[PDB]
């Protein structure tokens, strides 16, 4: 049980009488009043202690990544990796460490939709026996800006406009594209955010990245440069934009509910942890500077080396106390790992410590149960708001004769202390500059776009077309087009069509045809279809429902979550047409006999909005899902102009439909149904 | 200009050089580094004062009504109402008073959708020459509960489940309908929220209500019981649910954008302020108790008297600083 | 062990390596620098995490009573008091409940002197098995004002002037006496603070009072009005003002050290819990309104009835986490107790809950280890800054089908819930007024002054003289004199002498000769001299030290704490003359041979300030202490003009001095040494 250590702070209220927060049993359903229809009395301490705590429930949301959800689990190391790091949680084969992971968007506030288009956070804490180690990463391997001093500028430009606070959880507005085009470094992460990575199917279908180059350090101080990678065992998968928009309305909680259900049903998601390892003398060997967080390292140069695996198998018990309160920091480093002079990472170390002072209003947030390490805290820190401990050592200073030298100093040679990589040097003038090695902002955006499938490329161009068409300022749109043209003339021409602007002349300085592996989503079928969702459209009339149940029981044998839909909640019906939407499902199949709700009187009912069954099947088809009908229900496919000849369309007897849908779920999205520019 | 008094705190940065928060011109696009490809120095006060302010930008959202939007305007009294109240802002015909109004949903957090189904807030401040007078109202004339001590129970049951924080800005989950069926006082407001009042076309197309009976008091102490009413001059209008759902995703900001656009285009919305006035000895005479906020007073028993009109005609300059 | 429940939060750092606050062993004695003489790196996460915690150590001091000190202990009920109260901690003979008590002054900030003249706080938490019960009391039975809405006015006027923040921890300034004379209800507490109660010898030598009338309520709901009393088993004892002033400079920690020392040495202090009980129908029957907090109830009308005894026997382990962080509230009430319509009490209930949000910056302060009940917290409260628990019940609301009704409602007949006194009624118009029964501001101040000994009365007049003579505004002083004259014409005339003002005419509306017991300090000797301190003045030359060591040993057998003083820390010397002062001791004894340091060569030495042995003996005498000299050391007494047969002066052989000094410590202050008005007349 990854949550074992949290048991001592759990409060069970079963069978208990109500109390105040200072003890004593109470009733708290009536205010104390002066007479029968009288005024409430100041001396009602019960009322005021109850409402004061309510009045003060909220804490500030995170300044970025406010919308998110998390879970507990276990990391297991596959080896004794002491030859590359002194880090204790990687120090022995099959060694296990509890983790907590929080996934998030970036721009939107708490309560904004999961399926907004955005960069996604992927933040992991390892509760190691030598301290908490956080990998505070994203689902995209590069970041918008090269120097941390620019983060407020990026964030202000992307977050709502400060006069009217519009728009929520979106980059589709003037200020964001003004920044992206004025700060061309941002183009690489932008292209990723415009790809499938900006609208992932679920947290469980994301890869993760530390982004920055770090250092792994052995006991003797020898170091390797390292990039962290999480590789999802579920495979990467993405929505399409027109689907994500509706889903944002039909279920803002789509991703946190997906994670929760997967864990509750015993389908815990997993990621392998992998590293790229680079000798120090190769930091500038691959066409760019590994100190530069706007570039990633192509796997052709350094393959992913698997170190272990993480499985998230415990949901939290109280969201606020665990998920909302947890405080990640890239400065949560342990012996065997060190920083690099990445100017974005460098400033993150200050910001994450400082920002907890705002969110937790005090310096003792590491004493919160979800933040405590399992390894023991021994230092001379005292006092501060909410101090939860009582320290025994009176001589709270060092050095000291009176405390006999305890707590004692630890370094590289004694006490397994942290130490900075021994060979790191500083040289040159103190400067407010960036290295000229950071100056190429166009090659890797072009490399990324090159490495996607043709329809996948069309998704990127359509995201840009959608977003940039919201920019009211004409010159900003021209500036965007000028910058895009430096990545690919063809991308610029195709975007310019939507904006009504002239196709610019080629600017070939950075054009190239290179491709690299591992950045595409849609070029790979899924390794499993477990937990994927099938919507079975049925009806309460006739014998369709008994057939839907048979269909459901077979699909569930393959680990699918199956929802039988009908006009009302008859026996065997999981959901009404009123409550149902295609966005909830990975495949839609019409049970036999249910064609009667796709036209005629069966389609006109007070129990659901007009056309709802046809809209669900139309949506499912147009969003690229496997769709199907059993037997006579093929007429439902015809009613919307879909033919069985199509890829990802299945008709016929029950067993043929199950096999087709189950193979279609591995393809996941049928890109045949999306038009490409000039095709 | 309703925002006239706020011009003295307005800061114009056009044509200026960047400064720290304690003055002195700066550049703040590069961290100070120890060498060309070097670490950032702790002595870069410019970096840290800029990032400290960013790190500390957020404050707690309101415990309820966290999602909302507002604007400035003017209230004008239609008469000298001194015969029913000593209130200065109602003391002369054509007397003008600056207002600010914030509209809101109730359950959802800061970034939830405008077109969630919910009760809606309608809070008005009168900046009167005898102090600030707020009417903190809703777009529905009755409330769920009869005693303030039950507010945390109501709110906890409607807000997301505390184990996984699902569902956002919605009563369609077990705990909410557990509370509504266990605390039957809630059925009246529930029915209102289930009607078009729960999914209005815009803020400008809602009425507003004080809900509670208050008192109006004259100079010599004569009192009347009063219900406050805002009657929209734009007319009441609502969406249908299946459209509200898609709108929550296509444009979470639908209502705040609508308000902003109407004011900016010079189509300032208006509301009449109106009252029902009841004698003290009739507090229990209309088939219910007027101290009971789960009941409204049918207009057939006490018609509205119109006190004046409010027009919202200026958007804020900085949402955070004002709204 | 009263601290037992706190052992689960105690952190032992011995034998451990240094860590950060998120774990991982470190060194934290050098900043990370870019080169040998380089700038410090922002990536030094160890530096910043250490200094961030330091930079954020302080929390706001308490808005009043900021200066104080506390300890843990045990309360033992003397019987089953269910016939007067359903309160569980009073429910059975010999039932024991852990307590924490914090004593305090009122006006001074966190670092002000213990022996400032002030009212003193006396706040007790009972960690009962039915919730935390606090009696938030003072060492004086009456308060300055009658309505809580006036508390900011009182406190603003007594605290330092808001332009220059002068004076610290004192009422001797214009605004305080402007308030006292403009708000005459204040005069009664004023007289008490001008008496010995303003400058007590220690926290252990104070009585305590809840002040307000409260209610005790039985199971069936019958009630009695009650006044709470703490009666110190050590006896009441007080300093004199000229001594308390020097002590504020020579040891600002005198009271908190005294308490800490008493407990570390095994001399735990005790107080008995006593009540006065009044029938509900007699609330207005004793010449005043028992809802009036500016009045006390004479013991001649209702005698004290002892319910139990409290003993403080454990010091805190971390002062900040325990003493500083503890949050008292008169709203910390339990079943069997109820409030009254005392308009001062009513507003306190609001104030103490609200002020915790400022001092603790969040609503979860009852989760701090020192504030936690021992009886269990079960409700639908959630979230908030610093939430320390993880709640299991996801149906956090009532009423509810889904949580099966749990946590469940508790009331008078179900679940031993709190309940308001059943008979209480409200009647009449909503009003912003005070009952006319509250109107008499002078009779009880006169009763108090009448009940002190003659020299004790002179101490009160001399404190007023001292304080009022700091008032620069002439009319304020005349205002003070007119108000004093309504209490006693002789008091006003004796005060007016110091002020150079005219003796006012008698104004006899409130004059009377009544007296009451239990308000004096100096008319009763101490019941024990345990922990009292004897300074033995000795010297390093000759045989004095050997004799002084024998004197100390015999005196220690009687429970006294003895300090042998000499020029330097020779063998057997506890303290140097340079470090010593009469204020630290309750008796001063010159060891034989030490007359050498009272004149001639021995008196002028580089090792201590000129005249210091003589000054210690002079202060000890003039401040009323027992003073003595063994054998030839009688010349030290002669050298300061003290005669050997005076009261409280003992000379002779070792054994007679020990006996005389132990007897004189029971008297404690020898009041024959203080002149009373009229003594100097020719
Ligand atoms: C490689 C670049 C970056 C990555 C991968 C990243 C990732 C993340 C993630 C995953 C979170 C959410 C942690 C959680 O779930 O609680 C977060 C929050 C945050 N980030 Fe970053 N971020 C990056 C750049 C930056 C920069 C440059 C700054 C400022 C200098 C910054 C400041 C913050 C702050 C203040 C928070 C809120 C933390 C809290 O309140 O607990 N981030 N970031
Ligand atoms: C007639 C019934 C009620 C109405 C019409 C009402 C209306 C409102 C409105 C419109 C707001 C948002 C104002 C804004 O835009 O800033 C609000 C916020 C709030 N309400 Fe109510 N409410 C009612 C009942 C209650 C009750 C019974 C309580 C608690 C006893 C309560 C506590 C709060 C709190 C604490 C806030 C947050 C205000 C802030 O942080 O500024 N409400 N309410
Ligand atoms: C009979 C009258 C009063 C008595 C016996 C009394 C006693 C005390 C004591 C002993 C303390 C310090 C508790 C400690 O050691 O931590 C205290 C603090 C305090 N008192 Fe009173 N007081 C009285 C009147 C008032 C009134 C009328 C108010 C306001 C309406 C008030 C407001 C406060 C506040 C805000 C604190 C600070 C509490 C904290 O920060 O934890 N007091 N009082």
UniProtKB/Swiss-Prot annotation, chain C:
Ligand binding (heme): 352
GO molecular function: catalase activity; heme binding; metal ion binding
Top EC class, one word: oxidoreductase
PANTHER family xref list: CATALASE, CATALASE B
Function: Occurs in almost all aerobically respiring organisms and serves to protect cells from the toxic effects of hydrogen peroxide.
Cofactors named for this entry: heme
Keywords for the protein's UniProt record, in alphabetical order: Heme, Hydrogen peroxide, Iron, Metal-binding, Oxidoreductase, Peroxidase, Signal
Protein name: Catalase-3
Residues at the active site: 65, 138
Xref: Pfam families: Catalase, Catalase-rel, Catalase_C
GO CC annotation terms, alphabetical: cytosol
Swiss-Prot/TrEMBL catalytic activity: 2 H2O2 = O2 + 2 H2O
Species this protein is from: Neurospora crassa (strain ATCC 24698 / 74-OR23-1A / CBS 708.71 / DSM 1257 / FGSC 987)
Protein family: Belongs to the catalase family.
Keyword Iron included in the entry's annotation: yes
E.C. numbers: 1.11.1.6
InterPro entries the UniProt entry points to: Catalase (IPR018028), Catalase_AS (IPR024708), Catalase_clade2 (IPR024712), Catalase_clade2_helical (IPR043156), Catalase_core (IPR011614), Catalase_immune_responsive (IPR010582), Catalase_large_C (IPR041399), Catalase_sf (IPR020835)
Inducing factors: Induced under stress conditions, such as H(2)O(2), paraquat, cadmium, heat shock, uric acid and nitrate treatment.
TM ranges: none
GO biological process, one term: hydrogen peroxide catabolic process
């Amino acid at each position: 049980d990854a949550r074992q250590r949290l048991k001592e702070v759990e409060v069970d209220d079963n069978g208990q009488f109500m109390t105040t927060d200072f003890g004593g049993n109470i009733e708290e359903q009536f205010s104390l009043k002066a007479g029968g229809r009288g005024s409430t009395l100041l001396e009602d301490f019960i009322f005021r202690q109850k409402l004061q705590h309510f009045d003060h429930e909220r804490i500030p949301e995170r300044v970025v990544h406010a919308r998110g959800a998390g879970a507990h689990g276990i990391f297991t190391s596959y080896g004794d990796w002491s030859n590359i790091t002194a880090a204790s949680f990687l120090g022995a084969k099959d060694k296990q460490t509890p983790v907590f992971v929080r996934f998030s968007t970036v721009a939107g506030s708490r309560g904004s939709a999961d399926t907004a288009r955005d960069v996604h956070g992927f933040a992991t804490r390892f509760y190691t026996d030598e301290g908490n180690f956080d990998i505070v990463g994203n689902n995209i391997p590069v970041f918008f800006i090269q120097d941390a001093i620019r983060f407020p500028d990026l964030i202000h430009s992307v977050k709502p406009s400060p006069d009217n606070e519009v728009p929520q959880a979106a980059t589709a507005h003037d200020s964001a594209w003004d920044f992206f085009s004025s700060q061309p470094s941002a183009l690489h992460t932008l292209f990723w955010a415009m790809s499938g990575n900006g609208i992932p199917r679920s947290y469980r279908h994301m890869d993760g990245f530390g982004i920055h180059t770090f250092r792994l350090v052995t006991e003797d101080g020898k170091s390797k440069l390292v990039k962290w990678h999480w590789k999802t065992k579920q495979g990467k998968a993405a929505l399409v934009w027109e689907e994500a928009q509706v889903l944002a309305g039909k279920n803002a909680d789509f991703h946190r509910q997906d994670l929760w259900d997967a864990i509750e049903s015993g389908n815990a998601p997993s990621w392998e942890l992998a590293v790229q390892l680079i000798d120090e003398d190769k930091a500038q060997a691959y066409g760019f500077d590994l100190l530069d967080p706007t570039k990633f390292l192509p796997e052709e140069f350094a393959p992913l080396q698997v170190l272990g695996e993480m499985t998230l198998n415990r949901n939290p018990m109280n969201y606020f106390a665990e998920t909302e309160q947890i405080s990640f920091q890239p400065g949560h480093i342990v012996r065997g790992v060190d920083f690099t002079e990445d100017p974005l990472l460098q400033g993150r170390l200050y910001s994450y410590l400082d920002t907890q002072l705002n969110r937790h209003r005090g310096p003792n947030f590491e004493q919160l149960p979800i933040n405590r390490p399992v390894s023991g805290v021994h230092n001379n820190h005292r006092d501060g708001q909410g101090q939860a401990w009582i320290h025994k050592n009176i001589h709270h200073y060092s050095p000291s004769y009176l405390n006999k030298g305890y707590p004692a100093q630890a370094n590289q040679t004694v006490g397994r202390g942290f130490f900075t990589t021994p060979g790191r040097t500083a040289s040159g003038v103190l400067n407010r500059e960036l290295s000229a090695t950071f100056d190429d902002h166009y090659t890797q955006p072009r490399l990324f776009f090159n490495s996607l499938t043709p329809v996948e490329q069309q998704f990127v161009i359509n995201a840009i077309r959608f977003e940039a068409s919201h920019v009211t300022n004409e010159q900003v749109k021209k500036n965007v087009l000028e910058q895009l043209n430096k990545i690919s003339n063809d991308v610029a021409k195709r975007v310019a069509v939507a904006l009504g602007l002239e196709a610019p002349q080629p600017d070939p300085t950075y054009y190239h045809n290179n491709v690299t592996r591992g950045v595409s989503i849609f070029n790979e079928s899924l390794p499993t279809i477990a937990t994927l969702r099938v919507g079975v459209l049925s009806t309460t009339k006739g014998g369709s429902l008994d057939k839907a149940k048979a269909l459901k029981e077979q699909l569930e044998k393959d680990g699918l979550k199956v929802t039988v839909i009908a006009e009302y909640l008859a026996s065997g019906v999981d959901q009404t047409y009123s409550a149902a939407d295609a966005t909830a499902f990975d495949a839609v199949v019409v049970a036999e006999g249910a064609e009667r709700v796709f036209s005629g009187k069966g389609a006109m009912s007070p129990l659901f909005p007009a056309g709802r069954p046809s809209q669900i099947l139309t949506d499912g088809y147009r969003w690229g899902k496997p769709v199907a009908a059993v037997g006579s229900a093929k007429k439902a496919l015809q009613s919307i102009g879909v033919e069985e000849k199509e890829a990802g369309v299945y008709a016929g007897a029950q067993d043929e439909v199950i096999k087709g849908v189950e193979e279609g779920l591995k393809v996941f999205k049928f890109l045949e149904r999306f038009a490409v520019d000039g095709d």
